[PDB]
Each structure stands twice: as C-alpha cells, then as structure tokens.
Amino acid sequence: LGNLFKSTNFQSGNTDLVILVTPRVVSAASLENIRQVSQAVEMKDEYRNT
Amino acid sequence: LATPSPFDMEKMVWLDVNILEIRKSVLENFGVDWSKQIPGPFAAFGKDFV
Helix, strand or coil, X not given: CHHXXXXXXXXXXXXXXXXCCCCCCCCCCCHHHHHHHHHHHHHHHHHHHC | CCCCCCXXXXXXXXXXXXXXXXXXCCCCCCCCCCCCCCCCCCCCCCCCCC
C-alpha cells in the first residue's frame, strides 16, 4: 500500500566495448587481399543485378 | 668534353582505381503510445473557528 504514498525513480545501464587488432605480412597473392577483391566483385555483381 | 642529355626519359605508370560502396537501412515505428503521467486525487479543508 505504501506505493500510494511514495514515488520512485530508477535508472540502470551497462556498456561493453572491445577493440582488437591483427597485423600480417602479406603480398598481393595473400588470402587477406584476395578476400577483399572477392568482396568487390560480389558488390559489383549485386549492383548489376538490381 | 661529353655533355648530358636535356632530360632522361622515364617509364610511365598507369593507375586504375576502383571505389565501391553500398548502404542499406531499415526503419520501423509501431504500436500505441499512452500517457505516462496523469493528475492524481486532491483534497482540501477550510474552516473559521472565530
């Protein structure tokens, strides 16, 4: 019954954050370069099909 | 007694650059929005003893 004679204000929250990095020694034939070139080809194809 | 050339013929380089970007977005806003703060009950008294 006390909630008829009382006012309550409540706030709660949380934030999580992670920043991580990975360096690799590459050339133009390395897997990291090839995957992004493949991504570019796929983007072009999707644009064409629209 | 030898003399230099006016300049040296350099190799020429051709540069081909591709820049591909795609953006997508979705926005929804649905439901019923009610009032969250309404007036409460009131009481009052008044008298003149003398």
